[PDB]
Scaffold this active site. Structure first.
Site, PDB file in Angstrom:
ATOM      1  N   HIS B  90       0.818  -1.202   0.000  1.00 56.78           N
ATOM      2  CA  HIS B  90       0.000   0.000   0.000  1.00 56.78           C
ATOM      3  C   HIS B  90       0.851   1.252   0.000  1.00 56.78           C
ATOM      4  O   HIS B  90       1.999   1.266   0.433  1.00 56.78           O
ATOM      5  CB  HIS B  90      -0.948   0.044   1.210  1.00 56.78           C
ATOM      6  CG  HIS B  90      -0.258   0.061   2.530  1.00 56.78           C
ATOM      7  ND1 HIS B  90       0.393  -1.039   3.044  1.00 56.78           N
ATOM      8  CD2 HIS B  90      -0.176   1.030   3.479  1.00 56.78           C
ATOM      9  CE1 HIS B  90       0.887  -0.738   4.238  1.00 56.78           C
ATOM     10  NE2 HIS B  90       0.552   0.511   4.523  1.00 56.78           N
ATOM     11  N   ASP B  92       0.105   5.089   1.591  1.00 59.90           N
ATOM     12  CA  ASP B  92      -0.824   5.456   2.653  1.00 59.90           C
ATOM     13  C   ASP B  92      -1.911   6.388   2.153  1.00 59.90           C
ATOM     14  O   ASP B  92      -1.648   7.408   1.515  1.00 59.90           O
ATOM     15  CB  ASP B  92      -0.088   6.112   3.828  1.00 59.90           C
ATOM     16  CG  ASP B  92       0.872   5.174   4.507  1.00 59.90           C
ATOM     17  OD1 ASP B  92       0.512   4.010   4.752  1.00 59.90           O
ATOM     18  OD2 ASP B  92       2.001   5.627   4.786  1.00 59.90           O
ATOM     19  N   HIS B 226       4.627   0.287   0.707  1.00 62.76           N
ATOM     20  CA  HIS B 226       5.259  -0.502   1.756  1.00 62.76           C
ATOM     21  C   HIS B 226       4.326  -1.614   2.172  1.00 62.76           C
ATOM     22  O   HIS B 226       3.157  -1.639   1.812  1.00 62.76           O
ATOM     23  CB  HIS B 226       5.755   0.348   2.941  1.00 62.76           C
ATOM     24  CG  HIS B 226       4.710   1.123   3.676  1.00 62.76           C
ATOM     25  ND1 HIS B 226       4.188   2.306   3.199  1.00 62.76           N
ATOM     26  CD2 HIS B 226       4.137   0.915   4.885  1.00 62.76           C
ATOM     27  CE1 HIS B 226       3.302   2.767   4.069  1.00 62.76           C
ATOM     28  NE2 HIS B 226       3.276   1.958   5.111  1.00 62.76           N
ATOM     29  N   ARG B 240       3.977   6.873  15.406  1.00 61.80           N
ATOM     30  CA  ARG B 240       4.063   7.373  14.045  1.00 61.80           C
ATOM     31  C   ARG B 240       3.533   8.796  13.960  1.00 61.80           C
ATOM     32  O   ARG B 240       2.514   9.116  14.566  1.00 61.80           O
ATOM     33  CB  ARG B 240       3.270   6.462  13.105  1.00 61.80           C
ATOM     34  CG  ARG B 240       3.347   6.837  11.655  1.00 61.80           C
ATOM     35  CD  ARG B 240       2.553   5.853  10.809  1.00 61.80           C
ATOM     36  NE  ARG B 240       1.129   5.996  11.059  1.00 61.80           N
ATOM     37  CZ  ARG B 240       0.218   5.123  10.640  1.00 61.80           C
ATOM     38  NH1 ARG B 240       0.563   4.017  10.003  1.00 61.80           N
ATOM     39  NH2 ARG B 240      -1.066   5.373  10.861  1.00 61.80           N
TER      40      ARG B 240
HETATM   41 NA    NA Z   1       1.279   2.205   5.713  1.00 59.22          NA
END
Ligand code: NA
Ligand code: NA
Ligand code: NA
Ligand code: NA
Lengths: 278, 277, 281, 281
Positions: B90, B92, B226, B240
């Site tokens: 994917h 993001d 990723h 994150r």
């Molecule tokens: Na991601």
């Protein structure tokens, strides 16, 4: 009768019969021919009365019956109309139901001179043409069939290999339109096996293609066929259909339990499908 | 700094950096390295303060913020916690009109093996296509979408994105969120996307990172995909921060959207199950 | 194209028509011209009840279209009349001999012995296969070529042809790849080629683009090999025998390619994305 | 259930692979070798860093602790030490020489010249590939065999092996097909075989079943060829040279097949469902 098979696999056109006042003995012969040929075609039956059409279907079993378009006064006689759509996908009727129909009687009463053929496939040959290790595997599997649209939500679990009640012969019982997944495999294994089976089962050596003429009636055994309505026309096309019910599909008890995912497990298909249709 | 590339395609581990009080000039060098290597790894940053982490992310742009799980008192620090996994390639949030331009992720708790993350270089995925296919894709767009309870979003983005800083062209489709190419019919779209997804994640275009507690990954979400490997059962926890920038940009499409006919039904050529788990 | 001289029964919307009221044995020039128009309109035409058609008439008929192929079992004393005999089958979609620089432009086939059911032949309309692609994909294919090849003992041939050819007599564009003989698209790498050809082969033989003909005693099929594929269904064990004449002379033509051939690097290896066995039967 | 506490061990992924510190191969003792062999049975591929200068005699003696060594380019005076050279690559998943009736047990490889980045090698765990299949599919595969083959100038070889083999030293079952050399499953028809093998090839090389090793100066990899595949990433242009010793002696063994070989009919033609080009590079 004069019987003209369409292909080696299945299908036969039957001349010399008049459905309107068919005798019980002549009906038994049609039934014998349906077990042999899986779909039979009766030409030149224009004007067949509604009461006779219903009586004919009832010889096979109870008829499905009023929220869908039907003939005035006859909820058993469904109207199929291209302007109301079209089904260019291989399917066996209503296999998302616990008790799918055992067959149908369809007459196209308005249609173009060419275009709008219907194909059928022989699910006995689709199974028999698999090699022995795969036949052995499929005998022990079941599949979930489902539909999820406004006003109709249904699923059912059926054997992948169905034993026809009358012939005892084994037939593949998955179809691209309504089968979701094999229950004892993980979804990715299921996708790969079903993809192979769908394409193999509709090989031209297992199919027939019928060109509708005015007055033609098709009678098919929905236990051991798929069919496909070719979408190659723009003219108005209208059919009258009666749909027959019988016993639930039967095959071997599965030889494995259902596949059990772990909590949070995500199905990631190996092959792309769009997220939006049209 | 001491910079060690992980693969030819992308990825580099950077030693000699301390993010906690990084200078503006050292940050400029990290940014330069991020444009060169697409994902960079900074080991040994255990104990990085929340205020410094937020300040660091804000150097790249506005940070995403409270419905998502987040560090208490800091809605800008999102929590990735295995007990609360994404083993699908994917990019993001590309179902958003303005997907993030990148993220900073620190795995603070994790197993000694298992839980790697892979990244792929979408510049090389585009550049590795033959010229007729590059020319085709330059003129196409794709719909990216998500349809779940509480989150319904779609967006139309170029299939080939021009990176704002480098001017280099990158593939901008990904298996998780891309639905279909808008100017093709759905069946053609499926076939082309299937090829692109597999080609774009070829091992020659990827790197695989093994997380040590305290390590930080910074990636450019404009030109990577990723994948979080799902090969562990131990607790894994990451902090994150997610950065916003400009909308994805590429060529004006060279054809109109494909228009079905009123009754048209999409019949996929390849099976997907109708029920997930 | 106006075709009102005979009684014509189309088989499907896509292609195919059965022509009544014509006898091939002593056909006139006017009736031949109409059959040729019907072929340009319907791509494959079927002439029933032509049992006993003489060898000299069959050859003269073929020669009205062009030069006939001579060689390949043939009728004794008539090298132009080829024998298709099940004892001595082709259940794969193909366009005839496209591995040659000049494939045939069409054929005339009569099944003279066959089963009462089984052994149908299907044809597909390559105009519709191309026209059904979306505009970006038509634009791409217009600029591509493909290598068609065969490599067996005694016959090694390859040819490069446009992926989209113009029919010389109608000016209409048609797809010109087929699963049997097309190897790869020349301007793509092999993996891209495989993916695009796989899509095209299945799309181009969709039932909406095909017709299926059941052979009866004395039936003759005439098809235009420039804009069709065909497939011989292998669902029979009885003896099946056909007499065929093949009209030479096609030169598939289309746009100049818009890109050079794909050039691999030294030592580059083709790894297919999809499995094929390494051993056939 | 294998105890490996003698050295410092840094596993690469959950599935397989481990880097072993605190051991010098040059003058390894019997006890330290026994531990390395246990680590190989546990982790399938092990990596020994910083072994620059390892002598030819010690490298051969090490290999011979595992079994007989294979004896074309090789180190002068040491036919057992093969030279692999990028100038004289293999980006395809493979198990070594499975087209032979007795594929190697394993190998010892040291990259002695190579780029600072680029040229990684990946391995996959064929135990986990099998164990991750659902029970009906494991049961099917247990009863199948496959033909593995190669046909190149100077090397024509085929062998039939169980699809599921038992590791002779652990007793654990592993998948034993690989994309490079497996041709087809013998008890299925070729089309069924293609579909099942395509699924297995992709599933068996899922990232959850693999590890990826970056070669550093002095690195030695030792792998068990009985239960792994591997893949050399082709992402570099500089010279890459390795020294390799290959341990012979495998006889892949599994269950008796539960069905006979698939028998085609006379004249039957294999038509793959998926396109591969007819011409490589
Ligand atoms: Na991601
Ligand atoms: Na139906
Ligand atoms: Na032919
Ligand atoms: Na190898």
């Amino acid at each position: 009768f004069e019987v003209r098979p369409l292909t080696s696999a299945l299908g036969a056109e039957i001349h010399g019969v008049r459905l309107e006042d068919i005798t019980d003995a002549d009906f038994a012969e049609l039934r014998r021919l349906l077990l042999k040929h899986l779909v039979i075609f009766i030409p030149d039956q224009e004007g067949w009365s509604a009461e006779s059409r219903i009586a004919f279907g009832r010889r096979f079993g109870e008829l499905e019956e009023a929220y869908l378009p039907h003939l005035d006064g006859h909820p058993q006689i469904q109207i199929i109309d291209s302007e109301q759509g079209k089904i260019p996908i291989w399917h066996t009727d209503m296999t998302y139901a616990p008790n799918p129909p055992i067959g149908s009687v369809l007459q196209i009463v308005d249609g173009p001179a060419q275009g709008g053929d219907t194909m059928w496939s022989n699910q006995y040959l689709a199974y028999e043409g698999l090699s022995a290790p795969l036949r052995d595997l499929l005998d022990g599997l079941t599949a979930v069939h489902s539909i999820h649209i406004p006003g109709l939500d249904s699923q059912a679990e059926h054997p992948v290999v169905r034993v026809h009640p009358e012939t005892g012969r084994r037939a593949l019982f998955v179809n691209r339109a309504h089968t979701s997944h094999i229950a004892q495999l993980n979804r990715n294994e299921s996708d790969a096996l079903l993809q192979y089976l769908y394409r193999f089962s509709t090989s031209p050596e297992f199919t027939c293609r019928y060109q509708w003429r005015p007055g033609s009636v098709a009678i098919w055994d929905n236990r051991v066929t798929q069919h496909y309505a070719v979408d190659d026309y723009s003219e108005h096309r209208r059919g009258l259909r009666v749909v027959v019910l019988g016993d639930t599909p039967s095959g071997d008890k599965p030889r494995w339990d259902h596949y059990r995912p772990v909590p949070g497990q995500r199905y990631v298909p190996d092959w792309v499908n769009a997220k939006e249709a049209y």
